[PDB]
């Protein structure tokens, strides 16, 4: 009636814990100390039951799926919503002319990326 | 009672190790110096039971 689970990912104390088979993913994460500041509880089923030998992975915002605007290529840049050849090549032109981007809001200074455009792009970015 | 396993992949010291049959993959990988900075931790279950002649391959990120 006991389960051994590998609680890893964006949890405070990742390890191999021992809990009751009637426990649920939330309990195992609670025992592990909660979520780190980079976790994404969106993609975790906190209600799912625990079984022995189970692996509980908590991914981080991204996941991987983040394009580093400062060090991306035209092919990688235009992989995001809206950004195409000319919009991707202006973000790269601004990269090389007026320097790299400090924050996500620096994209607003690029021609073609307005407030509407930036909103459908924020969660897929990685601005050093 | 005894289980011999081959720990390969993104571990500090891959190779053959001996473990108790009642052990988990956590123990086998602890004997090899644990994972490395390039191990795809999402591809390794340390709560898994170990059996004799078992091969434990830890893939890298990007494989």
PDB file of C-alpha atoms in Angstrom:
ATOM      1  CA  UNK A   1       0.000   0.000   0.000  1.00  0.00           C
ATOM      2  CA  UNK A   2       3.112   2.210  -0.290  1.00  0.00           C
ATOM      3  CA  UNK A   3       4.546   3.902  -3.376  1.00  0.00           C
ATOM      4  CA  UNK A   4       8.029   5.050  -4.388  1.00  0.00           C
ATOM      5  CA  UNK A   5       7.923   8.023  -6.755  1.00  0.00           C
ATOM      6  CA  UNK A   6      10.590  10.107  -8.495  1.00  0.00           C
ATOM      7  CA  UNK A   7       9.418  13.695  -7.982  1.00  0.00           C
ATOM      8  CA  UNK A   8      11.680  15.843 -10.158  1.00  0.00           C
ATOM      9  CA  UNK A   9      11.573  18.970 -12.289  1.00  0.00           C
ATOM     10  CA  UNK A  10      10.745  22.466 -11.049  1.00  0.00           C
ATOM     11  CA  UNK A  11      10.178  21.356  -7.458  1.00  0.00           C
ATOM     12  CA  UNK A  12      11.909  22.746  -4.385  1.00  0.00           C
ATOM     13  CA  UNK A  13      13.518  19.474  -3.212  1.00  0.00           C
ATOM     14  CA  UNK A  14      13.663  16.906  -6.042  1.00  0.00           C
ATOM     15  CA  UNK A  15      14.230  13.335  -4.958  1.00  0.00           C
ATOM     16  CA  UNK A  16      12.825   9.835  -4.583  1.00  0.00           C
ATOM     17  CA  UNK A  17      10.112   9.808  -1.912  1.00  0.00           C
ATOM     18  CA  UNK A  18       7.988   7.144  -0.225  1.00  0.00           C
ATOM     19  CA  UNK A  19       4.267   7.865   0.168  1.00  0.00           C
ATOM     20  CA  UNK A  20       0.917   6.093   0.373  1.00  0.00           C
ATOM     21  CA  UNK A  21      -0.648   4.643  -2.763  1.00  0.00           C
ATOM     22  CA  UNK A  22      -3.761   6.735  -2.050  1.00  0.00           C
ATOM     23  CA  UNK A  23      -1.659   9.900  -2.356  1.00  0.00           C
ATOM     24  CA  UNK A  24      -2.041  12.242  -5.321  1.00  0.00           C
ATOM     25  CA  UNK A  25       0.391  14.300  -7.375  1.00  0.00           C
ATOM     26  CA  UNK A  26      -0.233  17.366  -5.205  1.00  0.00           C
ATOM     27  CA  UNK A  27       0.757  15.520  -2.031  1.00  0.00           C
ATOM     28  CA  UNK A  28       4.028  14.311  -3.556  1.00  0.00           C
ATOM     29  CA  UNK A  29       4.857  17.843  -4.715  1.00  0.00           C
ATOM     30  CA  UNK A  30       3.904  19.211  -1.299  1.00  0.00           C
ATOM     31  CA  UNK A  31       6.286  16.751   0.364  1.00  0.00           C
ATOM     32  CA  UNK A  32       8.926  17.851  -2.166  1.00  0.00           C
ATOM     33  CA  UNK A  33       8.584  21.443  -0.924  1.00  0.00           C
ATOM     34  CA  UNK A  34       6.380  23.054  -3.565  1.00  0.00           C
ATOM     35  CA  UNK A  35       7.223  24.545  -6.936  1.00  0.00           C
ATOM     36  CA  UNK A  36      10.255  26.609  -7.873  1.00  0.00           C
ATOM     37  CA  UNK A  37       9.860  30.102  -9.303  1.00  0.00           C
ATOM     38  CA  UNK A  38      10.315  28.684 -12.829  1.00  0.00           C
ATOM     39  CA  UNK A  39       7.766  25.850 -12.695  1.00  0.00           C
ATOM     40  CA  UNK A  40       4.639  25.688 -14.875  1.00  0.00           C
ATOM     41  CA  UNK A  41       1.844  24.053 -12.876  1.00  0.00           C
ATOM     42  CA  UNK A  42      -0.373  24.545 -15.945  1.00  0.00           C
ATOM     43  CA  UNK A  43       0.962  21.298 -17.432  1.00  0.00           C
ATOM     44  CA  UNK A  44       0.674  19.155 -14.281  1.00  0.00           C
ATOM     45  CA  UNK A  45      -2.322  17.087 -13.137  1.00  0.00           C
ATOM     46  CA  UNK A  46      -2.330  17.714  -9.390  1.00  0.00           C
ATOM     47  CA  UNK A  47      -5.350  15.411  -8.983  1.00  0.00           C
ATOM     48  CA  UNK A  48      -3.868  12.318 -10.656  1.00  0.00           C
ATOM     49  CA  UNK A  49      -3.329   9.349  -8.362  1.00  0.00           C
ATOM     50  CA  UNK A  50       0.073   8.018  -7.318  1.00  0.00           C
ATOM     51  CA  UNK A  51       1.322   4.560  -8.269  1.00  0.00           C
ATOM     52  CA  UNK A  52       4.566   2.857  -7.304  1.00  0.00           C
ATOM     53  CA  UNK A  53       7.509   3.469  -9.654  1.00  0.00           C
ATOM     54  CA  UNK A  54       5.850   6.671 -10.873  1.00  0.00           C
ATOM     55  CA  UNK A  55       7.804   9.628 -12.253  1.00  0.00           C
ATOM     56  CA  UNK A  56       6.456  13.118 -11.508  1.00  0.00           C
ATOM     57  CA  UNK A  57       8.037  15.744 -13.762  1.00  0.00           C
ATOM     58  CA  UNK A  58       7.173  19.433 -13.354  1.00  0.00           C
ATOM     59  CA  UNK A  59       8.300  21.432 -16.421  1.00  0.00           C
ATOM     60  CA  UNK A  60       9.419  25.057 -16.469  1.00  0.00           C
ATOM     61  CA  UNK A  61       7.943  27.968 -18.399  1.00  0.00           C
ATOM     62  CA  UNK A  62       9.163  27.316 -21.901  1.00  0.00           C
ATOM     63  CA  UNK A  63       9.865  23.622 -22.472  1.00  0.00           C
ATOM     64  CA  UNK A  64      12.981  24.592 -24.830  1.00  0.00           C
ATOM     65  CA  UNK A  65      10.115  26.379 -26.588  1.00  0.00           C
ATOM     66  CA  UNK A  66      11.731  29.816 -26.089  1.00  0.00           C
ATOM     67  CA  UNK A  67      13.529  31.693 -28.869  1.00  0.00           C
ATOM     68  CA  UNK A  68      16.449  33.809 -27.640  1.00  0.00           C
ATOM     69  CA  UNK A  69      15.718  36.990 -29.584  1.00  0.00           C
ATOM     70  CA  UNK A  70      19.278  38.269 -29.114  1.00  0.00           C
ATOM     71  CA  UNK A  71      21.018  35.140 -30.464  1.00  0.00           C
ATOM     72  CA  UNK A  72      18.373  33.676 -32.783  1.00  0.00           C
ATOM     73  CA  UNK A  73      18.476  33.262 -36.561  1.00  0.00           C
ATOM     74  CA  UNK A  74      15.997  34.477 -39.156  1.00  0.00           C
ATOM     75  CA  UNK A  75      14.766  30.886 -39.477  1.00  0.00           C
ATOM     76  CA  UNK A  76      14.293  30.544 -35.714  1.00  0.00           C
ATOM     77  CA  UNK A  77      12.791  34.023 -35.320  1.00  0.00           C
ATOM     78  CA  UNK A  78      10.151  33.569 -38.024  1.00  0.00           C
ATOM     79  CA  UNK A  79       9.120  30.310 -36.314  1.00  0.00           C
ATOM     80  CA  UNK A  80       6.997  32.380 -33.897  1.00  0.00           C
ATOM     81  CA  UNK A  81       3.518  33.816 -34.516  1.00  0.00           C
ATOM     82  CA  UNK A  82       3.366  36.734 -36.926  1.00  0.00           C
ATOM     83  CA  UNK A  83       7.122  37.066 -37.434  1.00  0.00           C
ATOM     84  CA  UNK A  84       7.972  36.484 -41.078  1.00  0.00           C
ATOM     85  CA  UNK A  85      10.907  37.239 -43.391  1.00  0.00           C
ATOM     86  CA  UNK A  86      10.742  41.034 -43.215  1.00  0.00           C
ATOM     87  CA  UNK A  87       9.587  41.216 -39.585  1.00  0.00           C
ATOM     88  CA  UNK A  88      12.262  38.700 -38.554  1.00  0.00           C
ATOM     89  CA  UNK A  89      14.983  40.493 -40.538  1.00  0.00           C
ATOM     90  CA  UNK A  90      14.131  43.839 -38.892  1.00  0.00           C
ATOM     91  CA  UNK A  91      14.451  42.345 -35.402  1.00  0.00           C
ATOM     92  CA  UNK A  92      17.861  41.070 -36.521  1.00  0.00           C
ATOM     93  CA  UNK A  93      18.744  44.431 -38.073  1.00  0.00           C
ATOM     94  CA  UNK A  94      17.905  46.181 -34.791  1.00  0.00           C
ATOM     95  CA  UNK A  95      19.982  43.555 -32.963  1.00  0.00           C
ATOM     96  CA  UNK A  96      23.072  44.591 -34.928  1.00  0.00           C
ATOM     97  CA  UNK A  97      22.413  48.336 -35.273  1.00  0.00           C
ATOM     98  CA  UNK A  98      21.026  49.660 -31.971  1.00  0.00           C
ATOM     99  CA  UNK A  99      22.423  46.808 -29.870  1.00  0.00           C
ATOM    100  CA  UNK A 100      20.826  43.789 -28.198  1.00  0.00           C
ATOM    101  CA  UNK A 101      17.456  43.870 -26.458  1.00  0.00           C
ATOM    102  CA  UNK A 102      17.407  44.467 -22.696  1.00  0.00           C
ATOM    103  CA  UNK A 103      13.800  43.425 -21.951  1.00  0.00           C
ATOM    104  CA  UNK A 104      10.838  42.003 -23.856  1.00  0.00           C
ATOM    105  CA  UNK A 105       9.476  45.541 -24.274  1.00  0.00           C
ATOM    106  CA  UNK A 106      12.498  46.512 -26.393  1.00  0.00           C
ATOM    107  CA  UNK A 107      10.874  44.774 -29.375  1.00  0.00           C
ATOM    108  CA  UNK A 108       8.431  47.702 -29.533  1.00  0.00           C
ATOM    109  CA  UNK A 109      11.248  49.885 -30.909  1.00  0.00           C
ATOM    110  CA  UNK A 110      11.476  47.661 -34.011  1.00  0.00           C
ATOM    111  CA  UNK A 111       9.530  48.586 -37.145  1.00  0.00           C
ATOM    112  CA  UNK A 112       6.614  46.195 -37.655  1.00  0.00           C
ATOM    113  CA  UNK A 113       6.464  44.934 -34.055  1.00  0.00           C
ATOM    114  CA  UNK A 114       3.783  47.028 -32.370  1.00  0.00           C
ATOM    115  CA  UNK A 115       1.919  46.530 -29.121  1.00  0.00           C
ATOM    116  CA  UNK A 116      -0.547  44.124 -30.745  1.00  0.00           C
ATOM    117  CA  UNK A 117       2.277  42.021 -32.200  1.00  0.00           C
ATOM    118  CA  UNK A 118       4.302  41.871 -28.980  1.00  0.00           C
ATOM    119  CA  UNK A 119       1.341  40.550 -26.978  1.00  0.00           C
ATOM    120  CA  UNK A 120       0.969  37.368 -29.053  1.00  0.00           C
ATOM    121  CA  UNK A 121       4.729  36.834 -28.656  1.00  0.00           C
ATOM    122  CA  UNK A 122       5.636  37.468 -24.996  1.00  0.00           C
ATOM    123  CA  UNK A 123       5.498  33.894 -23.580  1.00  0.00           C
ATOM    124  CA  UNK A 124       7.740  32.400 -26.302  1.00  0.00           C
ATOM    125  CA  UNK A 125      10.666  34.796 -25.775  1.00  0.00           C
ATOM    126  CA  UNK A 126      13.930  34.669 -23.822  1.00  0.00           C
ATOM    127  CA  UNK A 127      15.457  38.142 -23.486  1.00  0.00           C
ATOM    128  CA  UNK A 128      18.767  37.921 -21.526  1.00  0.00           C
TER     129      UNK A 128
ATOM    130  CA  UNK B   1      18.942 -11.169  -4.348  1.00  0.00           C
ATOM    131  CA  UNK B   2      21.827  -9.752  -6.396  1.00  0.00           C
ATOM    132  CA  UNK B   3      21.430  -7.720  -9.587  1.00  0.00           C
ATOM    133  CA  UNK B   4      24.242  -6.764 -11.973  1.00  0.00           C
ATOM    134  CA  UNK B   5      23.509  -3.764 -14.199  1.00  0.00           C
ATOM    135  CA  UNK B   6      25.238  -1.758 -16.934  1.00  0.00           C
ATOM    136  CA  UNK B   7      24.940   1.992 -16.313  1.00  0.00           C
ATOM    137  CA  UNK B   8      25.572   3.859 -19.574  1.00  0.00           C
ATOM    138  CA  UNK B   9      24.936   7.364 -20.840  1.00  0.00           C
ATOM    139  CA  UNK B  10      25.061  10.774 -19.158  1.00  0.00           C
ATOM    140  CA  UNK B  11      26.512   9.543 -15.868  1.00  0.00           C
ATOM    141  CA  UNK B  12      29.768  10.513 -14.198  1.00  0.00           C
ATOM    142  CA  UNK B  13      31.181   6.961 -14.360  1.00  0.00           C
ATOM    143  CA  UNK B  14      29.374   4.588 -16.729  1.00  0.00           C
ATOM    144  CA  UNK B  15      30.070   0.896 -16.379  1.00  0.00           C
ATOM    145  CA  UNK B  16      28.956  -2.275 -14.644  1.00  0.00           C
ATOM    146  CA  UNK B  17      27.780  -2.107 -11.037  1.00  0.00           C
ATOM    147  CA  UNK B  18      26.342  -4.557  -8.510  1.00  0.00           C
ATOM    148  CA  UNK B  19      23.146  -3.827  -6.557  1.00  0.00           C
ATOM    149  CA  UNK B  20      20.559  -5.621  -4.440  1.00  0.00           C
ATOM    150  CA  UNK B  21      17.577  -6.984  -6.348  1.00  0.00           C
ATOM    151  CA  UNK B  22      15.293  -4.950  -4.056  1.00  0.00           C
ATOM    152  CA  UNK B  23      17.061  -1.750  -5.147  1.00  0.00           C
ATOM    153  CA  UNK B  24      15.763   1.035  -7.377  1.00  0.00           C
ATOM    154  CA  UNK B  25      17.441   2.813 -10.275  1.00  0.00           C
ATOM    155  CA  UNK B  26      18.247   5.575  -7.780  1.00  0.00           C
ATOM    156  CA  UNK B  27      20.857   3.330  -6.158  1.00  0.00           C
ATOM    157  CA  UNK B  28      22.497   2.147  -9.382  1.00  0.00           C
ATOM    158  CA  UNK B  29      22.915   5.704 -10.679  1.00  0.00           C
ATOM    159  CA  UNK B  30      24.225   6.809  -7.273  1.00  0.00           C
ATOM    160  CA  UNK B  31      27.032   4.260  -7.646  1.00  0.00           C
ATOM    161  CA  UNK B  32      28.157   5.874 -10.927  1.00  0.00           C
ATOM    162  CA  UNK B  33      28.541   9.368  -9.481  1.00  0.00           C
ATOM    163  CA  UNK B  34      25.031  10.458 -10.432  1.00  0.00           C
ATOM    164  CA  UNK B  35      23.853  12.210 -13.563  1.00  0.00           C
ATOM    165  CA  UNK B  36      25.744  14.992 -15.345  1.00  0.00           C
ATOM    166  CA  UNK B  37      24.855  18.481 -16.547  1.00  0.00           C
ATOM    167  CA  UNK B  38      23.801  17.054 -19.935  1.00  0.00           C
ATOM    168  CA  UNK B  39      21.550  14.205 -18.762  1.00  0.00           C
ATOM    169  CA  UNK B  40      17.928  14.361 -19.928  1.00  0.00           C
ATOM    170  CA  UNK B  41      16.524  13.761 -16.454  1.00  0.00           C
ATOM    171  CA  UNK B  42      13.061  13.353 -18.005  1.00  0.00           C
ATOM    172  CA  UNK B  43      14.256  10.063 -19.571  1.00  0.00           C
ATOM    173  CA  UNK B  44      15.295   8.344 -16.309  1.00  0.00           C
ATOM    174  CA  UNK B  45      12.956   7.014 -13.611  1.00  0.00           C
ATOM    175  CA  UNK B  46      14.853   6.650 -10.337  1.00  0.00           C
ATOM    176  CA  UNK B  47      11.793   5.106  -8.655  1.00  0.00           C
ATOM    177  CA  UNK B  48      11.973   2.154 -11.060  1.00  0.00           C
ATOM    178  CA  UNK B  49      12.810  -1.341  -9.864  1.00  0.00           C
ATOM    179  CA  UNK B  50      16.070  -2.941 -11.010  1.00  0.00           C
ATOM    180  CA  UNK B  51      16.559  -6.492 -12.276  1.00  0.00           C
ATOM    181  CA  UNK B  52      19.616  -8.567 -13.121  1.00  0.00           C
ATOM    182  CA  UNK B  53      21.281  -8.122 -16.520  1.00  0.00           C
ATOM    183  CA  UNK B  54      19.491  -4.762 -16.717  1.00  0.00           C
ATOM    184  CA  UNK B  55      20.966  -1.990 -18.855  1.00  0.00           C
ATOM    185  CA  UNK B  56      20.393   1.582 -17.646  1.00  0.00           C
ATOM    186  CA  UNK B  57      21.030   4.125 -20.413  1.00  0.00           C
ATOM    187  CA  UNK B  58      20.771   7.831 -19.545  1.00  0.00           C
ATOM    188  CA  UNK B  59      20.317   9.855 -22.762  1.00  0.00           C
ATOM    189  CA  UNK B  60      21.614  13.370 -23.249  1.00  0.00           C
ATOM    190  CA  UNK B  61      19.533  16.438 -24.058  1.00  0.00           C
ATOM    191  CA  UNK B  62      18.989  16.614 -27.817  1.00  0.00           C
ATOM    192  CA  UNK B  63      18.943  12.861 -28.476  1.00  0.00           C
TER     193      UNK B  63
END
